[PDB]
């Protein structure tokens, strides 16, 4: 009841001894193996620690030192993204003229003529243009040397020290106990006002003293080298008031609360810096700031040892109602005793983020000079994209493991989950009509404006021009944001973002920056198109989550596992009723969604947005505004999009995008490759190997491990796998390419 | 319905049955082997043809076969 | 009781939940109206047989007779045909 | 240490060994005599 | 207090009683229209059927056809419609001459909801259901007629 | 000898709330299915067809659509809990048929009662070709 | 020549690709300062296109319409060195491989568990096998003779 530290000493032995023993972890795979079948199970069951045993405290462990080993990776990596910003880089030439020189941060060694790959990127640097946009977050952060990158680097390669000596420590040493980990209200606490609070306000804190102050010169003009170093800002604060005014006052205005004083770097204008292209820095550190406030008051809603502070399970059991019975109570004990409840659950809220950023990040550009790289954003979009995707489709996953191993009514019972099995039937039923019903109603019109334009009938389609159907709702919505500043919003200058309000069309360097965004019967059709999309994958995977346990065709599948491939040919056949099976077909429809919301947005931007800009105020886009009249049918995005974007990858050979041209065709093999092992079984494939082994056999070299063709669940991995990463890497070819190229 | 025969080389192990989820195998008395019983297949007309009793029999070839015949409502496995 | 060897029609749910079982709320006159020109198409092979020959020649007829101001697969072509890449 | 030796003979580790000792002298003879066609030395 | 209830208080029959399914307005509403009147000579109940349907039919195809601009023509796309009614007239009767034989009985149900004996609906049989599509048929192009009969002082005409 | 028990009706029914996984017509006018048990006490027990449904102590009867739903109902209250079952099937006459436990002992245990059905006295490998079999209505394992 | 071919020393397109090859690289080596670093690789670079067209024309490579080295497979003496010469090199390292790896699984077949010195490789054994390759064709040859290399009845 007492909140507490709590830790056992020496758990496990540090020893090599089970390094060379594979397969120690299960006690079946241990014993070395008799078929090649054994090699595979290895690495699939390298990571399921709850089945490796049934201890929840032991499972905790593992997870916490996974976790461990996990953030030191993620601190390696950013090593190396500082240091190669430092070692191989030209990001003392992009500071200086970020509007041409394009940002590189990998050199090519010579060796087979691979050196054509670093190509010309300006500021007198050959190498590979990098999109994943660190120049412009060094910039906005302040940095300007390559010692800083330096020591950045060497920062995060101690703090990859660091996270790999805690996990080895939590799990070899003091490795805490279960009623630690259970400690949900205490958690949640630290993680509101300690992690995200605090860590808010640390970056508001550096915003105001390096990033405004730096940037400020940075935009005036001032030469990097001749800038004052930021700690110059922290000793005599005339350099700060010079900049800023209000700092000569010294945190006066803050305790005696005439906060109205800091209005000079804590500003509400919003809109974009028409010198950058990115967000107001002044309104970014006052976000942090007000960001800071929220989460250090909201790390405060949980009780732990000082009475004071909510219980989570009272707040669960007191939300009943007439409709769902007891509803609540029960799912405080279940997400403190499954970690497939908690991964479904923060898997499908952390894509689903991850996607609310990639929207955002475009819309609003954050950092100086990113909206005018357009590789970059086109890159930080469709990344964090599929990141997303792939996000919630595993939070289908566990949350269909959760239903195999995690749940019992006898022990722990939700009134909800068993009112919604309880017509699973009707749920699923009802999502099924919703996702025909779309399919008619947005790919169905595609069909038709291709069979009237094929027809010579173009005022029989579905246009701008002849069947208009207006995204009226959408329309009217940015036009209310559009009017916000000044009424509903009197403390913003302008909008919120330039994709609202009428004109005020920002650009920086001859290229545009942000513009607003016509809306009209194309994107009233590819909107539709997402929703059905969605509703599909969505469809796919809660189907396989609720019919996980038990079925009408099968009444035991919860006792077949969550992962087997089927359960006969009988019934009629039974192939792929697993979960697992459900997840696997999940993937492909999450892909063929989130490509085509990439898609949407390269053609929207291309089309509408991305453009040069004359001195007289006259923009031509990349496109010429093509999207109001060949979006609306399938041929014309085989056409103008694919036929016509693809031209730059198809014609990269002989100059430094070449590598893109040799990946297009590579993911073209890998995505066909994949299409062995989804239309095949693995019975043909082992009879084949049959006459192999006789071969071998024959010549006195067959081996003891003997060969067994893919299980039927591997054969589905390996295919969505390859499918995935075939159409994936293809349209990152094409992507890169197409934009580098072009923008 | 879908035909299930038992051979003799069945050792008696009982396996057939117990996997079967529409109890359609028995063990009934024999001199054959060793464990006194074999298996039989009396109540095909509720088989479903999941070869779940395939997946359990140890001996080499198989003595549980379950061939695929004519569906019926009881071997498609509907509720409806 | 919900579980009745005897009558297995409430055993199993045989019910008519929505079924008014209540008499004619068409007043007479206006019934026999329709009871007597309905009539001769209340025999399902009949009609099946004036359907698809009463349908097939009324399909025929709008089809053989159809206006080049309405088809233009009628009007035909109105300008002067046009020239292969290599031939006519 | 007899452990650490029986891990570093694994299948994975023996096969990046093995192979990034094969890529670098194909790469120091591709490095030494760059491009070639064919056996020139007859 | 709980809202949801089994069907008829048998919780082992695959179905739920909810205020879109067991509710006074929603059994009353169904119990009202013609395909529910258990009690009422399936020509008669076609013909409503049919009124109704008929009658809507024009309006889509009218202001989505072809010659919905070429107003010298388009408002006899009610043709179309009637079209339709005469294919479903047709799917109504071959239904029929599949699903009932001449001298079978009712399927439908001969219960009632509180367990009493009922008579069952006619209309699942082969003369009442070919009364119900020569029902459907008079009134579905005579719904037609009457829909294209109307023309003038409508917004969307 | 060995003499099954008839269906009693009017035994008590789990309690259960009601789903979307019960009967549906095929009860109505093809067949449906039974299973009985005892059980010691109040449970709770998950169902082949939905949710969790309350055990009533002692005598239980419960209405499935299919024999698996019956079969595999009955293994997990023989497993989890430790219950003896039977099930039967009910045509629309009203007529009752006795399936399993069919000896009263379970098929897995062997009983001196029953007969040999479709036991083909050679090894598997033994069946002759498909053409000795041609124009015939006869299969090679028939035999 | 063969085939209707020229030698590469006698084609005009073939030298017309070494020129426009070199001059694509002198063009983007004039936008670099002479002492730069980009201008060495790029002036690396050009040494290294002249060394590979001239060694190309230096040993005897026939040439196309298309100004690109064809090789003849034929068996034509004056052009073992492509295929015929780095093929018999190829296939003795090919045969020590196969060799290798065959007398290390027949090593190991008759050990208690074979498997477990298949997924952890014995090096100690491997070490000790890996030259005995260097006699494949002698050491197979002599087994094909005694009746060692292929299993009797298989
Ligand atoms: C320059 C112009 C003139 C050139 C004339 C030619 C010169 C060639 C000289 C070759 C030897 C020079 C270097 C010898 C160093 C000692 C290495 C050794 O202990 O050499 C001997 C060893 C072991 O010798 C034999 O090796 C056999 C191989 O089986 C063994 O294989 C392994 C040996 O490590 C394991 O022990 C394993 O358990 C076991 O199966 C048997 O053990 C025999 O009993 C044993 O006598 O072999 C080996 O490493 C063979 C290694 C040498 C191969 C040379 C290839 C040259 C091409
Ligand atoms: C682009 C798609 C694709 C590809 C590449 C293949 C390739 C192959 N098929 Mg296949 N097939 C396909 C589609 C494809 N198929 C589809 C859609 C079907 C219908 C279901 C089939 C059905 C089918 C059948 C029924 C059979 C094959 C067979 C084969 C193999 C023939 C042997 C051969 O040619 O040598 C090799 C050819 C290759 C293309 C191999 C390329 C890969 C090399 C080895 C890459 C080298 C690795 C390199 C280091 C990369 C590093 C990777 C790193 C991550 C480790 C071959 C590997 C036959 C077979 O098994 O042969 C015995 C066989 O019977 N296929
Ligand atoms: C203000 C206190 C605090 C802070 C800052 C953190 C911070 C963090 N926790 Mg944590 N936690 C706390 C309290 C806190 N926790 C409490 C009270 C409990 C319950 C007892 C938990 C239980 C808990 C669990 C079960 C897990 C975490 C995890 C994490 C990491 C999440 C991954 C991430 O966000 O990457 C962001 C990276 C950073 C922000 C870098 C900063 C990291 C600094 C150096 C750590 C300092 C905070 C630490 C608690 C101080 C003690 C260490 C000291 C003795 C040396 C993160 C670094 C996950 C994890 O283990 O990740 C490895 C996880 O599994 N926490
Ligand atoms: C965790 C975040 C953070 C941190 C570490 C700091 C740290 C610091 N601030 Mg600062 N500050 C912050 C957030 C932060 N601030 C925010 C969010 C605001 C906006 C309200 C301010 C506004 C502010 C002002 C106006 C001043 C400082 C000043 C200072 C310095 C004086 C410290 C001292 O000597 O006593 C110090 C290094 C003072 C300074 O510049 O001292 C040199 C000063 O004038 N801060
Ligand atoms: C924080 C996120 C997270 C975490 C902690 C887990 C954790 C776990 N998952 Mg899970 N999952 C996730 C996200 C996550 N998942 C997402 C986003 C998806 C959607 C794709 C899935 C879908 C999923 C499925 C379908 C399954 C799991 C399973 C599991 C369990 C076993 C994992 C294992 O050992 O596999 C071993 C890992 C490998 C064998 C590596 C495979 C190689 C990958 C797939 C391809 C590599 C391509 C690479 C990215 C780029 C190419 C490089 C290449 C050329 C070299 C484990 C507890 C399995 C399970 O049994 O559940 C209990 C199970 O079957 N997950
Ligand atoms: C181009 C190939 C293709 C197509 C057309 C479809 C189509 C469909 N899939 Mg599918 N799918 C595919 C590939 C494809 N899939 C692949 C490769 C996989 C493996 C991963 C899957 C896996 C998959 C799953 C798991 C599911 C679907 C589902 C669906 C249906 C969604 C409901 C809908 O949209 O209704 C609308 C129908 C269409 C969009 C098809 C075109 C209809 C045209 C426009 C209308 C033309 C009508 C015309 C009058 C025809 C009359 C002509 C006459 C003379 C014959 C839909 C029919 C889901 C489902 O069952 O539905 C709920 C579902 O669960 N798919
Ligand atoms: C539903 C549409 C809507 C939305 C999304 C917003 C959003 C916002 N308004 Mg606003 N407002 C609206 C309608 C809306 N308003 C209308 C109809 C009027 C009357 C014409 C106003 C008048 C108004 C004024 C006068 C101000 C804002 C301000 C603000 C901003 C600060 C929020 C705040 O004041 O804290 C919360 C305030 C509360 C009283 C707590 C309300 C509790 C909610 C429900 C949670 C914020 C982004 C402030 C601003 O300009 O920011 C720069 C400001 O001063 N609004
Ligand atoms: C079976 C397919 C195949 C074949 C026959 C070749 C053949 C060749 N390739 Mg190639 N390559 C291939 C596939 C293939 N490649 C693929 C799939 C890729 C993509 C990854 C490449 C990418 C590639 C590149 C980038 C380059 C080549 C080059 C070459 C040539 C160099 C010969 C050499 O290394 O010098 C001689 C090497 C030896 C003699 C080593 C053997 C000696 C041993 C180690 C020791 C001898 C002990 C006695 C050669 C003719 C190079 C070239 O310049 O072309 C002219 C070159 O730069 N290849
Ligand atoms: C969220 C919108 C759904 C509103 C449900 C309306 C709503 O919230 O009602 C609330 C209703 C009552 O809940 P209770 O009173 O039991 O709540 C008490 C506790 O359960 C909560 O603490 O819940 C239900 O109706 C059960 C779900 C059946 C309804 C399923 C319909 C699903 C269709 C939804 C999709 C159409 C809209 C899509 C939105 C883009
Ligand atoms: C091709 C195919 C196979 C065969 C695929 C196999 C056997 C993959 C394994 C091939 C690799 C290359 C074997 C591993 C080789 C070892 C790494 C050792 C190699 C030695 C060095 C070169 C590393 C299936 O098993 C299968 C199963 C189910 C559905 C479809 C399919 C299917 O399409
Ligand atoms: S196939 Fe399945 S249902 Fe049929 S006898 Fe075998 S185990 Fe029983
Ligand atoms: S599984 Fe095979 S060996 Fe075992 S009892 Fe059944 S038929 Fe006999």
Known sequence: PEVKILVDRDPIKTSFEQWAKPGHFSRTIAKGPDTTTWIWNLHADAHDFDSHTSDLEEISRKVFSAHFGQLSIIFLWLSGMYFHGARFSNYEAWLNDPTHIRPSAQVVWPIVGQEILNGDVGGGFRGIQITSGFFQIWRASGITSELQLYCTAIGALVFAALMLFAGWFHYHKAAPKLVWFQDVESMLNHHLAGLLGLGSLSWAGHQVHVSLPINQFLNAGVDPKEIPLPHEFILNRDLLAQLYPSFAEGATPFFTLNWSKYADFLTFRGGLDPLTGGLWLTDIAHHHLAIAILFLIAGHMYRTNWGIGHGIKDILEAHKGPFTGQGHKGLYEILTTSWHAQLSINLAMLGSLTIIVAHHMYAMPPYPYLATDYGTQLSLFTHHMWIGGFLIVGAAAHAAIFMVRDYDPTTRYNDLLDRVLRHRDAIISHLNWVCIFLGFHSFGLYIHNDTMSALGRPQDMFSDTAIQLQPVFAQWIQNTHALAPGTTAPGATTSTSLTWGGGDLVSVGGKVALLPIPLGTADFLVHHIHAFTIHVTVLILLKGVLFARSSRLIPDKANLGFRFPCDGPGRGGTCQVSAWDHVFLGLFWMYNAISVVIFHFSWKMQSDVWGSINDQGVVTHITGGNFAQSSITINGWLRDFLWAQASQVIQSYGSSLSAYGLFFLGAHFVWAFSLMFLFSGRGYWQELIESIVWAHNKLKVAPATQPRALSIVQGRAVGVTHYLLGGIATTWAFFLARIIAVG | SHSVKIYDTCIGCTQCVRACPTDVLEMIPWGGCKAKQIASAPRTEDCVGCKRCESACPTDFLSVRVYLWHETTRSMGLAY | VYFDLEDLGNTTGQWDLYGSDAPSPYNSLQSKFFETFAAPFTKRGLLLKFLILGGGSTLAYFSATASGDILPIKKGPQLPPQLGPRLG | MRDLKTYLSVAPVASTLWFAALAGLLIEINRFFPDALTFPFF | YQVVQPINGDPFIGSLETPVTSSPLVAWYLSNLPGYRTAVNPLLRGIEVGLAHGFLLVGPFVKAGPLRNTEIAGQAGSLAAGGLVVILSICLTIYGISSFNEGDPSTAPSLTLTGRKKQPDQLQTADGWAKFTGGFFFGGISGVIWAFFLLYVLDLP | GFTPPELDPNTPSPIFGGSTGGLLRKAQVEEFYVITWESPKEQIFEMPTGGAAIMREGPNLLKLARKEQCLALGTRLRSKYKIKYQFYRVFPSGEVQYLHPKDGVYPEKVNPGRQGVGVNFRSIGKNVSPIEVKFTGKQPYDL | ?154
């Open chain 7, 1 to 154: 020549d063969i085939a209707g071919l020229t030698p590469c020393k006698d084609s005009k397109q073939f030298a017309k690709r070494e020129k426009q090859s070199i001059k694509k690289l002198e063009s983007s080596l004039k936008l670099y300062a002479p002492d730069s670093a980009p201008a060495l690789a790029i002036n690396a670079t050009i040494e290294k296109t002249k060394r590979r067209f001239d060694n190309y024309g230096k040993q005897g490579l026939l040439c196309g319409a298309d100004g690109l080295p064809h090789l003849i497979v034929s068996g034509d003496q004056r052009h073992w060195g492509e295929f015929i010469t780095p093929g018999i090199l190829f296939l003795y390292i090919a045969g020590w491989i196969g060799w290798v790896g065959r007398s290390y699984l027949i090593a190991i077949r008759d050990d208690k568990k074979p498997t477990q010195k298949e997924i952890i490789i014995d090096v100690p054994l491997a070490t000790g096998l890996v030259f005995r390759g260097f006699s494949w064709p002698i050491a197979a040859y002599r087994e094909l003779l005694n009746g060692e290399l292929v299993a009797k009845d298989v």
